[model samples]
Target: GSVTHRFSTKSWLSQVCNVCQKSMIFGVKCKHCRLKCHNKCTKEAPACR
Candidate 1:
């Protein structure tokens, strides 16, 4: 059996990837190739301000 996780979308300004300038919705798989980024560019998916 697998556990189901529910996630809600919030108003995250930083959730937008700096490279692609797209929202980091669903999930972020890559962190080395800069797949996901935020306003701070921490290289990790972060919540919006």
Candidate 2:
């Protein structure tokens, strides 16, 4: 026997992370930082990894 699988289209927000500005195809999170930083700015911060 064979089986068929179907997947739904991914949303725009799901493509990138609002924090690290990286691809969130794996996951997303909204954490608080000592200083204010935008999604793209966080990439330059030391707290980011």
Candidate 3:
């Protein structure tokens, strides 16, 4: 098969978005995708969840 994925949430923690490389919080952590983004950045971040 193949591999393709999308970002997901972990929890409410501190992290600098692996995407923007900026200090941000209340976002999502999709370790599989190695990406993190805020609400607007993620389009619906964990913070809103």
Candidate 4:
């Protein structure tokens, strides 16, 4: 029951994946758009700033 198009910027120890839209604690953040997601998605994500 998880569905979201946007990821929220969080420092509360509860992060959400921008691609998969799942709850995570060890999510990586995009340096450009500040998109948060798993380590796997960071490599696949766009290289923006």
Candidate 5:
């Protein structure tokens, strides 16, 4: 499957990253898969559901 990680420029609405479990100012939330993570940990995050 081909998955593209689209990161949000705005705040993650103040949520913890799924990859590192750390707070981040900007992060990603997959529009279709519900995956979440920080910009720094985007690559480290698991594959989309």
Candidate 6:
């Protein structure tokens, strides 16, 4: 199975996207590995690391 990601709207601050390397407003964050990115880019990004 793919890695698990805990999608959160509020990431405590304005975070950058690990997948696209852009500032995101309505992105989701991984609670397991601290991965941050836009919702749409989640699938494009590598599994939570």
4 or 6, which is superior by TM-score?
6
Model 5 whole-model lDDT (C-alpha atoms): 0.62
Q: What is the Cα-based TM-score of model 6?
A: 0.51
Best by TM-score: 5
Taken over the whole model, the C-alpha lDDT of each candidate is 0.41, 0.38, 0.50, 0.54, 0.62, 0.65
Please give the RMSD of candidate 1 to the true structure. Answer: 10.6
Q: Write the per-residue lDDT of candidate 6 for residues 1-49, one digit (tens) a residue.
A: 8665657775445666567766555467678777566765746877666
Question: Which of the two candidates, 2 or 4, achieves a greater lDDT against the reference?
Answer: 4
TM-score of each: 0.25, 0.21, 0.32, 0.35, 0.52, 0.51
Identify the candidate with maximal lDDT: 6
Off by over 4 Å in 4: 1-12, 42-49
* lDDT tens digits, residue span 1-49, model 4: 6333444344556566556666665465555355565655755565444
lDDT of 1 by residue, 1-49 (tens): 6343233333444455445566453333343333433334445545433
Model 3 scores a TM of 0.32
Lowest lDDT 10-residue stretch of candidate 3:
40-49
| Candidate 1 Cα misplacement greater than 4 A, ranges | 17-49
Model 6 residue-pair collision total: 0
Higher-lDDT candidate of 3 and 5: 5
Q: Rank the candidates by TM-score, best first.
A: 5, 6, 4, 3, 1, 2
lDDT of 3 by residue, 1-49 (tens): 6454455565455556544556555455454445556544654343322
Better of 3 and 5 by TM-score: 5
In Å, residue 29's CA in model 1 sits off its true spot by 14
Better of 3 and 4 by lDDT: 4
lDDT score, candidate 3: 0.50
Cα RMSD to the true fold for all candidates: 10.6, 13.2, 7.5, 10.7, 3.2, 3.6
